[PDB]
């Protein structure tokens, strides 16, 4: 166990308190915000009909690379009706994971929908306007429960 | 909803526990009237900057004033402050019964001392001195007036404890709630012994 | 503790699946609870 | 509660010193004797700051060392149950507007308007004291 | 004096002054990353977001528990 | 082993989420933000008035503005930026951060603030109302001096709506006077004692002191004066003391509610200084001390600003004023030590704090040459006391808000703000101001007193005039990228999502999440310094905190 | 060097302005010498950057230096302590009070407006044989027998026994140098004599300022009662000509409009002045008489309409 390399405490409670040098910040993601904006627009509410929480990872998922994106949808909240979008840019390799829940809805048939968009976002050169597509796309797809 | 999420016998509690830590309510109400105290100093002022401009007969020639009806409407100021630390001693116990005697007899007191003064408006202005008459018409009229308008917001409170006493079940919270109330009543007749010993007795 | 749940049924009569939803407005389904935009850009 | 009652102990002993200072060197020295504005005004800051140090002594007599004036108290030592923090009220916005009614009668001299803004000041102070004490409805 | 000339000095050198300081601070790097070009390496950490958009019912955590992920399909792609 | 976090957070949330809460707002936080985004808007109307003075003052003649106009202007914009900008915005920083750092849940009479909120809103606005009468808003100034404040001077309705609106402005001081004072006096943490709670805490309560010793007598003699202009009260007759009654109570109240003005912003800066230098505030106790001075000397030095009166006790003030002027060197010099050997990095908030430091010292200058009678005679009601105070006044209020806003916006907002946009607004504001008021000491000099509405072309000082008239308009497009900063980065902007977005901080408001929780925390550390926050993200420093503590 | 230096003094014309003049100077240079020590102070610690070299070592953080912080809180007790000294000092030099002074000038300063009465003039190498007449002086005693009351009232007045529009303060003069909206009042002044300056407010409490002088004092309705010293000597005025004057304190809403002028003239131009002015002649006759501008250089009674875009 340790905090994070420096400034970093653990509290009398489970909640870490962690702080930042004044001239850096905490998010570090690298998209402009006006992007990651639009990403959460279609996950937030380009989702609400779906009904499915949607989520997106664009982390690496190495090896097969559908056993980890099963397990990654084990982190996501509510993994029986949750839509999971996990790329690995490294590989180049998209997967799409779906739950129990959302069974039915049309999830199957937008599942190469969306591979296909985000695809082909990524191959003309933006990773997250194929996010962007994809979270669209699977949403129309999934008609609420 | 089996018996309670917190367990307190009353919708409101004492601000905090006052066995070992301060009353919050006492330590603002204190600190309120340690304010007012500064803004009758404000009409004090008035007053004693108007007395030293005066050509050696401070009250005019016009103005008369009438101890007859000024020192019993102080004596009934005095004795409705010991009527409210009584009804503070009932208070601090379980007592709302006792506390509610003492502050409507407290209430009723401070009506006659409020009925006094305005007879006492009455008799001055009817003979003379008054606001736009005079500067010492002026200067007395409005420290007493602002007194008055302090014994009144005390009446206010005192109705409105009343009444709170009778919608709730007596609480700690009300004892502290009576208990500020009565810090607020000593200030005012505390304030009108100084008004009193400045305008009747130093002049 | 000095209370009793309610339970409301109410006929409902559009569908309200367009328009607003309960996300925005939690009693969306209690009643007109949205206006179109374009009628208040005119 | 010792530091607290001290702070007001040190404010009342310089404005003692400062009105009596005042009273003195205008007094004499002055054109007019005393100001009679200063002098006051210094007199009672010296009084509101007597009474706000004298409570403040009183209660550091009367309460035992408090973890909030105790060095070394751990966090859990002032765990409990804090007393009641008035939540969400609309009273206060709507004892502002009675007084801001008032305030208007009293600037434009309205007697009507004094009168209402009076009225209004007194339901909305009945309304905040009452909130948390108005018992359930009997029907 | 020449009304013209010093009501359009109030009215310019607080706007010139303005473009200047904006030039030289507002057109300086931000914070913020640069945007991860798709040739370079995923330098990042995993990133894993949600939607938070469906309601959880109760909002404690305790008594959620673990029934499954129960997958439930699966699709995949490379570029 | 990672978390399902957004991609952004919440921009603006759900729609009519805040209405109610505002409305019927309990919590000290968003009582604190209202009160800073209600006195900020009041600082632009403010503002607003005094461009509109200067462009009528780059002309020797009345290009736009006739005098009574220009009047108003100037009493208006005085009154709105002491009484409806600064008093209130001291106490939203109170409501703000206070109860955060004495580790408290909320304030002591948490409705008690939100009507003194409601009280100064209600209350502002009915001052500025005197505007839209026909006879216009108080002519008199800020000061409102005696025979030209009765009815038989100045008789409009704007004086009695002014009078009226600046007594219930004061009411809602006093409340938050004495919710502050209760609040510092029983709520606080349970190791958190007097001695340890940061220099801001301290500033406040001793200005709230200050406010209950004072406005109580702006009350009084506002209500003196009403009574004398809708009674013919003879209160303040010149045939009586009046003109000097007036001058002694309404000075009485000022000169100790322009250290109320002061003192809440020396402990922001006092905050500020200590987390970017990465070291403690040099000389916490000689801080605290020197604020009780402060307090003291101030509300017995008031006559100071009466001196070409002919009527006050000369000696007695102008020693009191030195004796006053000594504990702000004392800590102006507190304020550089800490500075002293630690690794500056000046982001906004301390680019703002040095800009305090550096003007303030003019202003300071100003003020200590002013406190000879002698000398002010000379400058007495000129510009040149209107540049001091305007000095001290932008230091200590404009600048030093601007640090408090840029520090504690994340601690408010969860989000931070644009630091280039901060640096543009910083440099413009310092520029502008030191262009505008700099040149008005020697405006001042030469014969031009405070309150013309025009003068002479054949008099002098209208280059300096036009000069400041710039300065003037470069402090109103400096004004511009501030409030696009806040309104780009309230709802977007750069999330910070840990506490201390300024690393290195202290005061025990940085340990508790960056938007803190409904009550302010979930945790809270081992109070044992002045710096809980720094003690618990750095525990290694701990033991360094108490060994180079006595070297100084 | 000294001019630049005096953050725009107007140079003194009076002992008392040049010693006032020398005090400011001195104190200019004192906090001029504070203010560059501070922002040297201030920019050193600035230089103090967070250097990129430096690695994760925090600074000693020391605080709490007793030594220096008594030595920079005594230190400066020293320097108000002198600079008090010297005020109080120059102060002394504010009213000498003489009770014989040179030429006494009652400054009347009614709403908007000036007005000088001449008062008394009585020069030490003899001549002068002048003084105010005073006859003007009349109360608004109301010590009426009955007030609205049938009897028994006999209300004397409301204040002091008089009513508060009284006068009996406002001294008047025979010769009056009133000044209307349309042409600047002119006192005029003997050079190197002491001038007594009685100063009242007919309306309201308002400054009487020379900025030549380097001196001013507000023009109170009733000093006398407001405890205050409207009397002010000057001891002595070396250089002639005209100086300008304007109302230092908010007069109302024409507070702009109340500039006058001191046409300070030598001892025999004044007594000729003073001759032609006793004899019925406007203030601009009797100074055109001594071969003088007879209105205001320094200063035009500028224009009474409301602005540039009032329609004439
Ligand atoms: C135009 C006319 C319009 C209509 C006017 C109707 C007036 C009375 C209607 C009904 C009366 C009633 O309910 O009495 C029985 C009532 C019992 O009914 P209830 O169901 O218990 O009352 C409902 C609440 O539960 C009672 O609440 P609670 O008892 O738990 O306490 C809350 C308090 C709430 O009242 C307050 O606001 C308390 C604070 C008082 C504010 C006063 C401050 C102003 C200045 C005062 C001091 C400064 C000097 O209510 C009361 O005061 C109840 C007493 C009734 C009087 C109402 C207020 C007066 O009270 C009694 O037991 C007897 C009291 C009777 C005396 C009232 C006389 C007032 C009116 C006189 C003539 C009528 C107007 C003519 C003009
Ligand atoms: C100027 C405007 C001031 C006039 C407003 C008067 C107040 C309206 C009555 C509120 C009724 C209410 O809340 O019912 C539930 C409330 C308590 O129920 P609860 O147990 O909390 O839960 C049941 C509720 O349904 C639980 O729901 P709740 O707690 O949300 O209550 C809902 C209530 C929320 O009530 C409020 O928040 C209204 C009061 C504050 C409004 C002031 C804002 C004025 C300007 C804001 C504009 C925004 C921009 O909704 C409204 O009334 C919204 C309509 C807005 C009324 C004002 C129109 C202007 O019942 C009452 O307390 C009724 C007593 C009525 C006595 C009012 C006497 C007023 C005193 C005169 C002084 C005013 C100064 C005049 C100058
Ligand atoms: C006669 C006039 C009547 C007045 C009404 C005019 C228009 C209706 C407004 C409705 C009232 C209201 O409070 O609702 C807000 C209303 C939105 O409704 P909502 O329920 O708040 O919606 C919830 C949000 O979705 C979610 O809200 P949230 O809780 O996240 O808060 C987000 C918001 C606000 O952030 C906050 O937390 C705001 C808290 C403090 C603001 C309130 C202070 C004033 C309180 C007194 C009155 C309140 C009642 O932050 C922003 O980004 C706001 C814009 C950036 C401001 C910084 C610029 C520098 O705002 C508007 O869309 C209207 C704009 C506000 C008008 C005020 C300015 C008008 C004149 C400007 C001149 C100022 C200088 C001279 C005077
Ligand atoms: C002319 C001068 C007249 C002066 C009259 C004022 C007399 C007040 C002294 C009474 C003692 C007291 O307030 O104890 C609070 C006491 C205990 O409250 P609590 O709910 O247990 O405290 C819980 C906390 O507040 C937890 O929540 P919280 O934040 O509400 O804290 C309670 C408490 C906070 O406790 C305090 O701070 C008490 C005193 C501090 C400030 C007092 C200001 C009151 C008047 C200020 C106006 C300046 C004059 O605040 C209140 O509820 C007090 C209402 C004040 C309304 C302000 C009106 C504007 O409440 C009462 O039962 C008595 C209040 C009755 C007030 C009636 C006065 C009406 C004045 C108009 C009459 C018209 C005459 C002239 C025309
Ligand atoms: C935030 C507001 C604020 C602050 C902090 C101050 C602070 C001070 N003020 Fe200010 N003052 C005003 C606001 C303020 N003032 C206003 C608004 C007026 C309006 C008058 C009107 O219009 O009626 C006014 C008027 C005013 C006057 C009246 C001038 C006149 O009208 O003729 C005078 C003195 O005459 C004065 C003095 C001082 C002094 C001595 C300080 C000091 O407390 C602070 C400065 C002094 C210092 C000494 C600090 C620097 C110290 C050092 C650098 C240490 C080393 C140096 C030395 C030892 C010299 N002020
Ligand atoms: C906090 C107090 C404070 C602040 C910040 C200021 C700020 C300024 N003041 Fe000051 N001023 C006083 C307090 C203050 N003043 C006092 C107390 C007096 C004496 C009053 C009296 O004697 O009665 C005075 C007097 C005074 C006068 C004397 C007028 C006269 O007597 O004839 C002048 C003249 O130029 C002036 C100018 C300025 C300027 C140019 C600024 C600038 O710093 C202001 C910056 C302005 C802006 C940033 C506005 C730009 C904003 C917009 C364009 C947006 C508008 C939008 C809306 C309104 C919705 N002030
Ligand atoms: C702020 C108030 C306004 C401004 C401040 C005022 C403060 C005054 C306070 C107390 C005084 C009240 C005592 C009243 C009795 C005194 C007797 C007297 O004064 O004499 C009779 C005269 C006639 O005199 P006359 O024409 O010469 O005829 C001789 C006949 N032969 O009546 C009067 O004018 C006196 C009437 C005064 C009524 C004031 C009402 C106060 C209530 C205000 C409510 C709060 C407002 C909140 C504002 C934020
Ligand atoms: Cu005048």
Same mark, same amino acid.
């Given at each position: ?145 | ?203 | ?42 | ?139 | ?79 | ?35 800073? *985004? ?329 003020? *200590? ?126 999330? *910070? ?53 006595? *070297?100084? | ?312």
């Amino acid at each position: 166990e340790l905090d994070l390399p420096y400034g970093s405490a653990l509290t009398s409670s489970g909640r870490i308190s962690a702080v930042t040098e004044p001239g850096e910040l905490s998010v570090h993601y690298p998209f402009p915000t006006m992007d990651l904006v639009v990403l959460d627009d279609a996950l937030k509410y380009g989702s609400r009909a779906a009904k499915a929480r949607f989520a997106v990872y664009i982390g690496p998922l190495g090896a097969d690379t559908a056993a980890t994106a099963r397990e990654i949808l084990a982190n996501v909240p509510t993994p029986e009706n949750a839509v999971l979008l996990a790329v690995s840019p490294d590989q180049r390799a998209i997967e799409v994971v779906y739950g129990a829940d959302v069974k039915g809805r049309g999830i199957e048939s937008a599942a190469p929908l969306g591979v296909s968009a985000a695809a082909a976002s990524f191959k003309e050169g933006n990773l997250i306007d194929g996010l962007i597509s994809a979270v669209r796309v699977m949403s129309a797809g999934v008609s609420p429960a | 909803m089996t018996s309670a999420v917190g367990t307190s016998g009353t919708a409101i509690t004492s601000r905090v526990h006052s066995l070992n830590r301060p009353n919050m309510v006492s330590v603002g109400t204190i600190v309120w009237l340690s304010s007012e105290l500064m803004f009758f100093a404000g009409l004090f002022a008035m007053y004693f900057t108007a007395r030293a401009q005066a050509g050696g007969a401070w009250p005019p020639e016009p103005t008369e004033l009438n101890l007859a009806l000024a020192v019993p409407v102080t004596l009934v100021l005095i004795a409705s402050s010991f009527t409210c630390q009584m009804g503070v001693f009932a208070a601090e116990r379980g007592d709302v019964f006792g506390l509610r005697r003492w502050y409507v007899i407290t209430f009723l007191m401070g009506l006659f001392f409020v009925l006094g003064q305005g007879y006492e408006y009455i008799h001055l202005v009817e003979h003379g001195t008054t606001i736009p008459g005079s500067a010492y018409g002026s200067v007395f009229y409005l420290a007493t007036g602002f007194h008055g308008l302090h014994v009144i917001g005390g009446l206010v409170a005192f109705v409105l404890l009343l009444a709170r006493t009778k919608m709730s079940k007596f609480t700690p919270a009300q004892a502290t709630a009576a208990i500020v109330v009565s810090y607020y009543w000593h200030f005012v007749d505390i304030v009108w012994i100084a008004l009193f010993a400045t305008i009747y007795f130093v002049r | 503790m000095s209370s009793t749940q309610d339970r409301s049924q109410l006929d409902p009569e559009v569908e309200r699946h367009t328009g607003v939803d309960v996300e925005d407005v939690p009693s969306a389904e209690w009643g007109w609870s949205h206006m179109p935009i374009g009628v208040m850009h005119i | 509660m010792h530091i607290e009652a001290r702070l007001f102990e040190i404010l009342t002993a310089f404005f003692a010193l400062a009105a009596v200072v005042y009273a003195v060197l205008t007094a004499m020295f002055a054109t007019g004797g005393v100001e009679w504005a200063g002098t006051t005004a210094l007199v009672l800051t010296t009084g509101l700051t007597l009474i706000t140090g004298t409570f403040f002594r009183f209660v550091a007599r009367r309460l035992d060392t408090r973890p909030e004036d105790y060095e070394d108290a751990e966090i859990s030592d002032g765990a409990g149950e804090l007393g009641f923090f008035a939540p969400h009220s609309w009273w206060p916005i709507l004892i502002s507007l009675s007084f801001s009614t008032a305030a208007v009668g009293a600037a434009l001299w309205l007697p009507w308007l004094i009168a209402a803004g009076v009225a209004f000041v007194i339901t909305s102070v009945c309304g905040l004291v009452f909130e948390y004490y108005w018992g359930p409805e009997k029907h | 004096m020449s009304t013209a000339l010093t009501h359009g000095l109030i009215g310019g050198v607080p706007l010139v002054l303005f473009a200047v300081l904006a030039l030289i601070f507002l057109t300086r790097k931000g914070p913020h990353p640069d945007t991860y070009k798709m040739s370079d390496p995923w330098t990042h950490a995993p990133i894993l977001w949600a939607a938070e958009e469906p309601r959880e019912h109760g909002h404690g955590g305790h008594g959620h528990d673990s029934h499954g992920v129960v997958i439930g399909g699966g699709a995949s792609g490379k570029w | 082993e990672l978390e399902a976090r957004r991609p952004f957070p919440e921009r603006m949330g759900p729609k009519g989420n805040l209405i109610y809460k505002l409305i019927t707002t309990t919590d000290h936080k968003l009582i604190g933000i209202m009160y800073c *985004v209600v006195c900020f808007a009041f600082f632009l109307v403010g503002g607003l008035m005094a461009l509109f003075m200067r462009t009528e003052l780059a002309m020797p003649g009345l290009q736009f503005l006739s005098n009574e106009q220009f009047n108003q202007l100037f009493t208006m914009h005085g009154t709105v930026m002491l009484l409806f900008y600064a008093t209130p915005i001291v106490f939203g920083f109170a409501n703000l951060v206070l109860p955060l750092q004495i580790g408290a849940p909320d304030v002591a009479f948490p409705r008690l603030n939100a009507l003194s909120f409601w009280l100064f809103l209600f209350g502002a606005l009915i001052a500025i109302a005197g505007f839209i009468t026909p006879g216009g808003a108080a002519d008199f100034g800020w000061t409102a001096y005696s025979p030209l404040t009765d009815a038989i001077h100045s008789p409009g309705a704007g004086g009695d709506l002014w009078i009226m609106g600046l007594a219930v402005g004061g009411l809602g001081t006093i409340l938050g006077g004495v919710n502050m004072i209760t609040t510092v006096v029983c709520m606080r943490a349970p190791g958190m004692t007097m001695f340890r709670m940061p220099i801001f805490t301290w500033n406040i309560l001793v200005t709230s002191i200050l406010v209950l010793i004072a406005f109580p007598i702006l009350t009084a003699a506002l209500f003196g004066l009403a009574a004398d202009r809708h009674l013919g009260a003879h209160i303040y007759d010149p045939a009586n003391g009046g003109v000097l009654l007036w001058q002694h109570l309404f000075w009485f109240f000022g000169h100790p509610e322009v250290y109320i003005i002061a003192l809440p912003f020396f402990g922001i800066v006092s905050e500020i200084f200590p987390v970017f230098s990465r070291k403690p505030i040099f000389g916490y106790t000689t801080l605290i001390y020197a604020t009780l001075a402060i307090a003291a000397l101030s509300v017995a030095v008031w006559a100071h600003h009466m001196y070409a009166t002919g009527a006050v006790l000369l000696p007695f003030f102008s020693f009191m004023t030195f004796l006053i002027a000594v504990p702000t060197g004392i800590k102006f010099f507190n304020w550089i030590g800490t500075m002293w050997k630690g690794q500056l990095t000046f982001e906004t908030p301390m680019l703002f704090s040095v800009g305090f430091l550096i003007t303030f010292l003019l202003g300071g200058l100003s003020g *200590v040459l002013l406190a000879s009678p002698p000398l002010d005679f000379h400058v007495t009601d000129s510009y040149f006391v209107i540049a001091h105070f305007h000095y001290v006044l932008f230091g200590t209020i404009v600048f030093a808000t601007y640090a408090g806003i840029y520090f504690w916006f994340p601690k408010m907002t969860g989000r931070l703000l644009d630091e280039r946009l901060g640096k543009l607004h910083f440099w413009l504001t310092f520029i502008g101001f030191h262009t505008t008021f700099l040149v008005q000491h020697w405006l001042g000099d030469e014969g031009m007193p405070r309150r013309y509405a025009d003068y002479l072309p054949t008099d002098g000082f209208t280059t300096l005039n036009v000069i400041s008239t710039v300065g003037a308009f470069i402090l109103g497009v400096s004004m511009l990228p501030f409030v696009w900063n806040v309104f780009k980065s309230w709802r977007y902007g750069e999330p *910070v999502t840990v506490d201390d977005p300024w690393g290195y901080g202290n005061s025990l408001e940085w340990a508790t999440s960056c938007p803190p929780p409904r009550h302010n925390f979930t945790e809270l550390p081992r109070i044992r310094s002045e710096r809980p926050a720094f003690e618990l993200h750095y525990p290694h420093m701990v033991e360094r905190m108490r060994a180079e503590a006595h *070297v100084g | 060097w000294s001019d630049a230096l005096a953050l725009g003094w107007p140079t003194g014309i009076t002992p008392e302005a040049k010693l006032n003049r020398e005090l400011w100077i001195g104190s200019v240079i004192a906090s001029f010498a504070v203010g560059a020590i501070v922002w040297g102070l201030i920019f050193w610690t600035s230089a103090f950057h967070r250097k990129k070299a430096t690695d994760t070592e925090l600074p000693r953080q020391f605080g709490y230096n007793m030594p220096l912080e008594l030595t920079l809180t005594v230190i400066p007790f020293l320097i108000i302590s002198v600079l008090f000294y010297f005020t109080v000092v120059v102060q002394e030099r504010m009213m000498h009070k003489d009770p014989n002074p040179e030429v006494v000038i009652d400054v009347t300063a009614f709403q908007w407006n000036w007005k000088f009465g001449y008062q008394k003039i009585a020069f030490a190498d003899g001549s002068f044989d002048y003084d105010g007449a005073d006859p003007e002086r009349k109360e608004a005693m109301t010590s009426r027998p009955e007030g609205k009351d049938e009897h028994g009232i006999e209300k004397v007045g409301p204040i002091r026994g008089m009513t508060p529009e009284d006068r009996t303060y406002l001294n008047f003069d025979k010769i009056e140098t009133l000044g209307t909206s349309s042409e600047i009042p002119v006192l005029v002044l003997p050079a190197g004599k002491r001038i007594e300056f009685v100063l009242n407010s007919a309306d309201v409490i308002h400054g009487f300022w020379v900025p030549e002088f380097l001196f001013k004092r507000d023009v109170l309705p009733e000093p006398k009662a407001n405890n205050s010293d409207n009397v002010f000597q000057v001891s002595e005025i070396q250089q002639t000509g005209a100086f300008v004057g304007r109302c230092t304190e908010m007069c109302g809403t024409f507070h702009a409009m109340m500039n006058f002028e001191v046409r300070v003239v030598e001892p025999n131009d004044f007594k000729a002045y003073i001759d032609q002015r006793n004899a019925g002649k406007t203030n601009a006759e009797a100074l055109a008489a001594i071969n003088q501008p007879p209105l205001a250089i320094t200063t035009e009674p500028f224009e009474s309409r409301r602005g540039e875009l009032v329609p004439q």
